[PDB]
Amino acid sequence: EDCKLARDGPPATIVAIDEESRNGTILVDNMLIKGTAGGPDPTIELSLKDNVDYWVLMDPVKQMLFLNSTGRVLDRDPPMNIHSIVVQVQCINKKVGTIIYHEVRIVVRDRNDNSPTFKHESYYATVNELTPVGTTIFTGFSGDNGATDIDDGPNGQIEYVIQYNPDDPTSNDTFEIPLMLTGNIVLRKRLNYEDKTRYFVIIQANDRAQNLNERRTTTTTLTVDVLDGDDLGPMFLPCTYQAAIPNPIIVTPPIQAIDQDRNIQPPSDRPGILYSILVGTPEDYPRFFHMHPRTAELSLLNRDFHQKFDLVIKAEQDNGHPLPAFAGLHIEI
Amino acid sequence: EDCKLARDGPPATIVAIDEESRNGTILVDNMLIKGTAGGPDPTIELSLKDNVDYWVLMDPVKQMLFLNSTGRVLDRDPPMNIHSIVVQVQCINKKVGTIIYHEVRIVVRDRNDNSPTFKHESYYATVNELTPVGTTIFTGFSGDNGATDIDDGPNGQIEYVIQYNPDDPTSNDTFEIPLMLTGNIVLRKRLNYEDKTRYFVIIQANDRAQNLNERRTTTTTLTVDVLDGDDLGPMFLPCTYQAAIPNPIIVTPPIQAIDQDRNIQPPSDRPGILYSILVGTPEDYPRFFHMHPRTAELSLLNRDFHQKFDLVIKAEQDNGHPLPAFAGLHIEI
Ligand SMILES: [Ca+2]
Ligand SMILES: [Ca+2]
Ligand SMILES: [Ca+2]
Ligand SMILES: [Ca+2]
Ligand SMILES: [Ca+2]
Ligand SMILES: [Ca+2]
Ligand SMILES: [Ca+2]
Ligand SMILES: [Ca+2]
Ligand SMILES: [Ca+2]
Ligand SMILES: [Ca+2]
Structure with missing residues (x-):
């Protein structure tokens, strides 16, 4: 028994x-x-x-x-x-x-005796200033290339959450993590490179233990750099061109433009300027004037018939973003 | 003789x-x-x-x-x-x-004895914050509804030119007149309504007399108001929904979202929110749960088979801009 x-x-x-x-x-x-x-x-x-x-x-x-x-x-x-x-x-x-x-x-x-830990010491992204709000701009916490947690079940899941940067109080406001579990960052405000080109974004990972008092965390800085987009066309220099006649025709100062976006990367993408005449008076001006479209050099083609010609000059970008700039040119006889 | x-x-x-x-x-x-x-x-x-x-x-x-x-x-x-x-x-x-x-x-x-004069005492425009840089946003100086000059020839032509506002040093920077003769204003920087909603833009009209020392001017303030665009979707309230079972199912707190853009005009355009369940575990959750897609009301459809269901809830806009928001919901038995 x-x-x-x-x-x-x-x-x-x-x-x-x-x-x-x-x-x-x-x-x-x-x-x-x-x-x-x-x-x-x-x-x-x-x-x-x-x-x-x-x-x-x-x-x-x-x-x-x-x-x-x-x-x-x-x-x-x-x-x-x-x-x-x-x-x-x-x-x-x-x-x-x-x-x-x-x-x-x-x-x-399992107990929640282990905290999240980020694989990298810091993270980093870029974003062109033309990116619309809503756009996912970073996904580096996928691939278990973000935080990990050795614990099991929820003791082991991450929620990622942006935190206030006292050394960058704008970072907070300009990005979000709609889905905490992915930790994708999303552009929340429009950007002007011209104003501010870098953001330090503290992200706090935290495990998801049931007892919220048992919940470990980590933080990381994400550095985000803004890229200068092509939102502006050229501008003439020095920052109403004058000519005189009784060749090539001398123009004071000499017609020169330049793209207004001042840090396009790569340079490969830095565009070129195309000069044309646009409108003019007397209206028979085409009879007498061409201008070379990459160097702005005056082709000439009668004192008492025409005392003067007054033209206006376009310069525009050569990449299907004309975004054109304008400048006058007067010409006495 | x-x-x-x-x-x-x-x-x-x-x-x-x-x-x-x-x-x-x-x-x-x-x-x-x-x-x-x-x-x-x-x-x-x-x-x-x-x-x-x-x-x-x-x-x-x-x-x-x-x-x-x-x-x-x-x-x-x-x-x-x-x-x-x-x-x-x-x-x-x-x-x-x-x-x-x-x-x-x-x-x-003719002499240049007359100055430009604006038809109106002030001018005024609006612009949705989603407008891209490059966009013409004002054309009220056409129609001779801008400045006029009684004088003849150039003594009578206007060039319009933005001036620095000491009571709005940002106005200067955020708009331009590419063509001085039209006086169309063009958006020069991206906008966040959320940051600043009004701009006072001084424009200076000036005649175009030959002797630049004989050139009269006028100024005007243009007030420009920024309009809240739909660049943000909903957000749940109060700013992880909990339920329990051994109908309709009571949810603490109650599922409510709201559009995040807080001044859409007209109200006609204020959209509506659509609630769905998205993902869940155990994965057989669809067997037991529908949710009414305009009110988020729990349809129910076994203690020792399923201890708990943990779902995640979408709310999105109903105007082909889902821009969706997310929120968990846990459900014990
Ligand atoms: Ca453990
Ligand atoms: Ca352990
Ligand atoms: Ca843990
Ligand atoms: Ca730019
Ligand atoms: Ca450009
Ligand atoms: Ca006169
Ligand atoms: Ca007079
Ligand atoms: Ca005048
Ligand atoms: Ca908005
Ligand atoms: Ca909206």
């Missing part, structure tokens, strides 16, 4: 304990095994079996199991991955000679 | 004088008419003819003509439009009886 379970219920003893419990922690009150080990005339014999690196010790009389973790650590996490522990409690019957193995399964439960 | 011209040259005397000359101004030195009026025995008789409101007086002996403008003004401009003056100098010959008319044409020359 003895050496079989005294309790009702199923024939494994299943129990659970928080990971990171310390030496001596009870694991089973009372196995509750019909019979009595020890005393003067013991009726059963108990011992442990498949107890590797003796994580369990036993008190055969009270039939009670303790953890045995001195010096070592009961870590459910990488790199230990101790999720359960199974051991067997071989009982021998001293009369009848019966030998049973009582299984004891011990379920270690 | 006498009473014919003594000078060579053509048979009209043409001469010119600046408008706004004052009484006594000589108009002809010497008509230079063969013969001699007055003295003891005059040989010719001179008088004026077609001299209306006697703008000319004559000295028959010296054969000299003076202006006669006392009390009145020699105004080439509207509303006087005195461009020339023609009079005839009837000479009679006292022997032979010859009668000639010497024409005298007097060409009044």
Whole structure:
């Protein structure tokens, strides 16, 4: 009869304990095994079996199991991955000679003992100033190239969240993370490179433990650089061109324009200027004037018929963004 | 012989004088008419003819003509439009009886005695914050609904030019007039309504007289109001929804979103919010949950099969600008 379970219920003893419990922690009150080990005339014999690196010790009389973790650590996490522990409690019957193995399964439960950690020390993005609000401009926290958390379940999920930068109070306002779980940054305000070209964006990763009081965090700075877009065309220099006649025709000062965006990258994209005449009076002006369209050099083609010509000059960009600039030119005879 | 011209040259005397000359101004030195009026025995008789409101007086002996403008003004401009003056100098010959008319044409020359003037005391425009740089946003100086100048030729043309506002040093920088002659204003920087909603733009009109020292000007304030565009979608309130089960299902707090742009005009354009569930676990969640797409009301459709459902909720705009917002919802059993 003895050496079989005294309790009702199923024939494994299943129990659970928080990971990171310390030496001596009870694991089973009372196995509750019909019979009595020890005393003067013991009726059963108990011992442990498949107890590797003796994580369990036993008190055969009270039939009670303790953890045995001195010096070592009961870590459910990488790199230990101790999720359960199974051991067997071989009982021998001293009369009848019966030998049973009582299984004891011990379920270690993750705790939120680990914080998020970012793979990189800092992160970094760029964004052309023409980007519309709504645009995702950064996705570097995917690929597990962002924060990680060694813990399991929600103890191991990240929500990313922008934080106020006291050394850049504008950063806060100019970007967001609509989806906390992705941690994609999204442009929230329009930009003028001309005004401000860099943003320091603190992002705070945080795990998602149920008890909000058990929730670890990290932060990182994301440096974001604004890129000069082509939103402006040329401008003449020096910042009404004058000519005279009774060749090529000398023009004071000399017609020169330049793109107004002053830091296009790469230079490969820096466009060129095309000069034309646009309108003029007397209206027969085309009879007498061409202008070379990449250098603005006066082709000439009658004092008492025409005292003077007054023209107006276009310069525009040569990349299907004319964004054109204008300047007069007077010409006496 | 006498009473014919003594000078060579053509048979009209043409001469010119600046408008706004004052009484006594000589108009002809010497008509230079063969013969001699007055003295003891005059040989010719001179008088004026077609001299209306006697703008000319004559000295028959010296054969000299003076202006006669006392009390009145020699105004080439509207509303006087005195461009020339023609009079005839009837000479009679006292022997032979010859009668000639010497024409005298007097060409009044515009002066820059009049400044530009704006039709309105102030001007005004609006502009949605989504307008791209390059966009013409104002054209109210066409139609001669801008500045005018009563003077003629260049004395009468306008160039419009933005000026620095010390009470709005940003206005300067945010708009330009690429074409001075039109005076169209063009957006020069991107805008965030959220930051600044009004601009006071001083524009200076100026005439285009040749002598730059003779050039009159005017100024005007243009008030420009920024309009809130739809660049942002909704946001949930109060600024992770919780539910429980062993209908409709009660949600704490109750799911409510709202558009983030907070001054769309007209209200006609204020959009509506559409709620859906997006993703969920356990993944069989669709078996049990619909949500009404305009009110977010939980349709329900097993304690030991499913302990809990954890869903995530979209709210998006209903005008083909989803610009969607996200929020979790947990549900215990
Ligand atoms: Ca651990
Ligand atoms: Ca852990
Ligand atoms: Ca954790
Ligand atoms: Ca630019
Ligand atoms: Ca450009
Ligand atoms: Ca006048
Ligand atoms: Ca005048
Ligand atoms: Ca004028
Ligand atoms: Ca807006
Ligand atoms: Ca909106």
